[model samples]
Target chain A: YDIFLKIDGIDGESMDDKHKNEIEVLSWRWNIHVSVTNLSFEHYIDRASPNLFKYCSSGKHIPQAILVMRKAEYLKYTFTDLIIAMVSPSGSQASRESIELSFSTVKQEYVVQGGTITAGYDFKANKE
Target chain B: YDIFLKIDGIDGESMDDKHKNEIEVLSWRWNIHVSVTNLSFEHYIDRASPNLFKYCSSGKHIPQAILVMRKAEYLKYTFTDLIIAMVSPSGSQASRESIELSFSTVKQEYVVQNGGTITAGYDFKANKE
Candidate 1:
């Protein structure tokens, strides 16, 4: 029921002025009634000094927007999505990224829905 | 890369008057520009008969609604979501089901985010239970 995610360091090094200045990690658990269940996590890198980041969830909540289940039943759930955005020193919107991943009770399976992950200053500049 | 999905038959039996009369399988690949990439699939069950359904997709398309990669570079991709809805004989609202799964080039990993799956009339009625 636990999941691990690895966020690669910008260009294989720690964050610096030349590379991304700040990294913001946003995650949530999706539930039945627009309810937001807090997903507790522990990380290896410093929040102020970000680098290749890694995270693991407690598997205490489900992460989808809506779920239909029978009453008096306990079902296994996982987070629905993850967004990792890199910000420049000036914080003028460098790149916004998202990924779709889901776990289900019926098949008891984990799946990867595709999305984008970018790095480096050149990748930011070219997109601008 | 290719992904296979198995849709279980109602109550482990084929469609009958007492069970669901019809099943509708809806799937799409999310892409940039809001384009829908048709996921080509071959099923083992008869579309008209609607038993336990199984599908395999051709690796010819990326399923996510948006993707960013090095220009001219090809990255492995998979479908963003899949929805399976069962229709009652009266054709009224029965139940809607969805799941979250994603693939990324960074880790080259396939992950199951989390969602719900249900089956049978008793299960559905118990929801009203």
Candidate 2:
């Protein structure tokens, strides 16, 4: 119940108009609302500092659980400095993912209904 | 570099019309946008069914990572069974969400940002809850 991933760093990273237009109205990638482990509950689409994004929920909603996948399957036998979860929104979910089964050697990857798929992911980003 | 979360499902969940009016133009409780490994982006938002709500983009845009977190960091991962992925209307995002999260050991619960802080929630029985 207290598995909060502390991704603290962006006080000044609060929402701006450009950011607002992206999430509230402009975002077009994903729209998942399955009440998964309370995280899906009443929260806002907000961001952290460089290289991270998160959904911020307060105690008011008391997050509920709808889609209960295996908890221990992940929390067990695995560990990392950080964990990242990615979904392939409606558009990408419709077609087949080309990055297929290639990286399973370095991580865990699977495709479900519409990219609710989550496994260990190693991110390779361009540095400044 | 696209992925979005649509909370329009809670359009009438508890976020009252009042706060909605203000926050509509004011600030938000939180906001996120990242360039995760595109689950194969270069796609639009308009898609098929099974979602309580949704957000739409354009042929000019692409989808990114969107998810709800939970115990064991599980993804409640729900999505469209079919998809259009073509340029549509802005209302697609708003109207789709007008359809469908936080939880409880309970049911439909919601609250939103107001004057920049969490405000009271409401329901059909009328905020009496």
Candidate 3:
């Protein structure tokens, strides 16, 4: 299974100088929990496009990243709880930001050779 | 496109005597918004299993509901915002519970010739599900 993530933008208004720097550093953590397995992935953001960091630095682009896991890693379960977190460059406990999202694999479809599991989650503010 | 929803259970702890009664009268409302269309669907929950209301009233089954729409209704857009709300028995402004969830269809796949679009969404407590 492959997990794709795009950091559309960050609410700078909610950040202090430290958090702002943390955002630029661009590191995140995610954990997937299922009936039979517990897994975690962590890495620094990748620049998918020239304007990827435009919103944070100067342009209007969002940061993106991807993680590819073997089907044997997760397909055994019928449900999954995905927890995502953003950490500072130091990777310290104090600078961690996290949110919990849930999903049910009961309806997911898979292929035999090699299939893709993609999620397009872009963070956007509710302007209304 | 077909949207399926299952009302796993209601948080009775967060309800008043009236809200408790409101749940027993299972009814819900949902709105779908895209670039070109805005649609809403309202209906009562269906008893799928024998113990559907087990937690709310007496049994141990969760209520379930389903909504089906044509691909033309939602396929034209690349993104969709689905809002679901639960209304009270009176269907008045006084008692309403709602939540907003967002999804992007940029990665959605569609089949041709009376194709199939399915979304299997079930509500469940974090009991480590």
Candidate 4:
């Protein structure tokens, strides 16, 4: 029942200026100059209750989290570092930012536990 | 390395009211009450310059699509049916609507060919603050 999700719009809205500013501070703190935009969400939908996807189908405001990468190197982050970085003057700006960052890092930790990536959908158009 | 990608926002924007209205018309044409809001995209990013993912790192306006399900039975659609339904009066409204719906069905077709979900990176955030 596990699946991969990408980072999408942040904070109950599209990835606008507020999101960018927070990520900029995060990137600065993480010593990374990552221009994170056009974001999406990727995760493993575990077969359990009280999870993000559990209320997804019902339109509940499922709390989401993301991680500001030092680079797009994939799962190259630590939760403690994420928390500490978020506590910075600029880092602790938004709650959604912290939530998404934590969620993404947590998933990365799960990936380190022997999870795998597989082909799910194509999602292309025009050319067959 | 190959992997499964889920559907996200279409045409450089989140799934907003415009997206939902289009999906509603799509559902009506197909005789379904699919409240297709908060839609997502699932696609493969081929290792080619013209592919979506190839330029995703560069922040290009990559085209995206979604499907209007009659219910929730994954991949229960036909291209001909979709096209005809889209041609319906209420269907041919927004350009983005057609693009996404078509794109979703196209991916479903690919899944019918050969596929499996996978995990890659979980370090990117969806929002900042």
Candidate 5:
């Protein structure tokens, strides 16, 4: 992660066991400028498996190899070239330098200047 | 379409405009056999565009070319070899001859024995406006 990104406060204990081993569903909301606040995060489920996500990055898919990212301790990585999952079909201008995101889990919420990563029910409201 | 499969009651008039131009999102649920009833369709967003779905048929994605499908007027086609979007993570056996689904929208709902397709905000309950 860069100086601008941080994914904090996720507890494995907070996750629901029923959803354990289940794929994650998410609503990612963000904007390209500091002026936008009412923007909403769109919800989506990870409809593919781990291997598909790695190879289909070349295709017209979101959560691309370089976009939706995860951080592992033993094997560390981050989304360096990350941008919005869906670009504005309507032409709009903004820079990676100016992007803002609205993020939340069951316990807390934050407005990230750039973005963060999450998966599984641990980050969800399961409170389990 | 075939006699065994039918997707009815999706009216363009029922769709929400703000969600227009958006790719379709879905939760497809089905089994290989007829014994399961508590079965539910798992929710998922279309993380890719129309183009990606076609090429990645060779990949490990849901809504594959032959899986997630749609029917056009002049260009009519169907998912002839349809099965559940996600196979059981454990070793469970079922038959395509006896599958079912629970489907709903802003206006209507049904339990399809096979499956169906949808897209855009038009099918969404845009009444929030």
Candidate 6:
């Protein structure tokens, strides 16, 4: 019924082998989608209703669950305050992934395929 | 050659035992510090150099690394654009843990003990920060 997205890697039990790049992509995705859901679904549902429900049913897709790991702190950050942060492009790698997760959901427990990527948003400084 | 702070649990190879609360804090810490470092250190280091350096050396302690996992989407969010969002409190549980990670750094690899907590920042509005 719900889609959960998580990093293949990044938990504290094995953080010794994880990289920030990986963690970065993972955290960003969770924050954006989850935050959007929280803001519109629970908090602003009344204001976001009809449109949000319509989006969920037709325009936007809903994911069953999202899984992020390794650094519990990042999870804490997302669940706390970072998900609301919006960027210039609107959707980042994580956001796209969330969409994909929603699309990829087969609604079968322990029988769904996951996704991954190697790129993220990088804003290079301008040269003088 | 860096201090990597991670959660006690939550990994895909073994995430079967992980929980959302554990993943939340870990991701938050990594985003705040790393983004602050990226924005001020790399992008605007010239403007942030002195204070940033001072903060790194004396004013604000620098953490080696903040670990977050299980839900990779959150990590992507923080690194991409969420760290810049300033909350009312300024520092959440993840931010505070980052501070502690900086302080608790024994600087002895494989010998330094990590940290953990049961509480996290909650808005009662949205699930993700």
Model 2 misplacement above 4 A: A1-8, A11-83, A87-128, B1-95, B98-129
Writing each residue's lDDT as its tens digit, candidate 5 over B3-122 gives: 112222110111334332222323344332313222232211112211221211212222211122333211222222122222111001110112222222111222243565342211
Q: List the residue pairs that clash in candidate 5.
A: A29-A41, B15-B122, B16-B121, B32-B95, B32-B96, B33-B95, B33-B98
Best by TM-score: 3
| Complex DockQ, candidate 3 | 0.01
What is every candidate's alpha-carbon RMSD to the true fold? 22.0, 22.6, 20.9, 20.4, 20.7, 20.4
**Per-model CA lDDT versus the true structure:** 0.24, 0.21, 0.25, 0.23, 0.22, 0.22
Candidate 6 lDDT by residue in tens digits, B68-122: 3322212211122112211111111121212222222211112122543332332
The CAPRI classification for model 6 reads as incorrect
Task: For model 2, report DockQ.
Answer: 0.02
What DockQ was computed for model 1? 0.01
Candidate 1: docking tier: incorrect
Which tens-of-lDDT digit does each residue in A16-96 have in candidate 4? Answer: 432432222221111111121112222221222123332333333324434433222222222211111121112242322
- Across A1-128, the per-residue lDDT of candidate 5 in tens digits comes to 11111222111111334332222312233211212121222222222322223322333322211112122111111221122332221224421111222222111111122332222111123221
lDDT of 2: 0.21
Best prediction by lDDT: 3
Residue A7 of model 5, lDDT score:
23
Q: Name model 6 segments beyond 4 Å from true.
A: A1-41, A44-47, A60-128, B1-129
- DockQ of every candidate: 0.01, 0.02, 0.01, 0.01, 0.02, 0.01
Residue A69: error of model 6 in Å?
Answer: 27
The per-residue C-alpha lDDT of model 4 at residue A53 equals 32
- Please give fnat for model 6: 0.00
What is candidate 1's lDDT per residue for B9-118, written digit by digit as tens? Answer: 22221243423422233332433222232332222122221111111111112233222122211232323332221211100012123222222211122233354323
Residue-level lDDT tens digits of model 2 in A1-128: 10112222222222443232122112111222211111121112233312223322111211211111121111111112223233222223222111001111111122233453222222232110
Where model 5 places Cα greater than 4 Å from the true spot, the runs are A1-5, A8-128, B1-29, B32-34, B37-69, B72-129
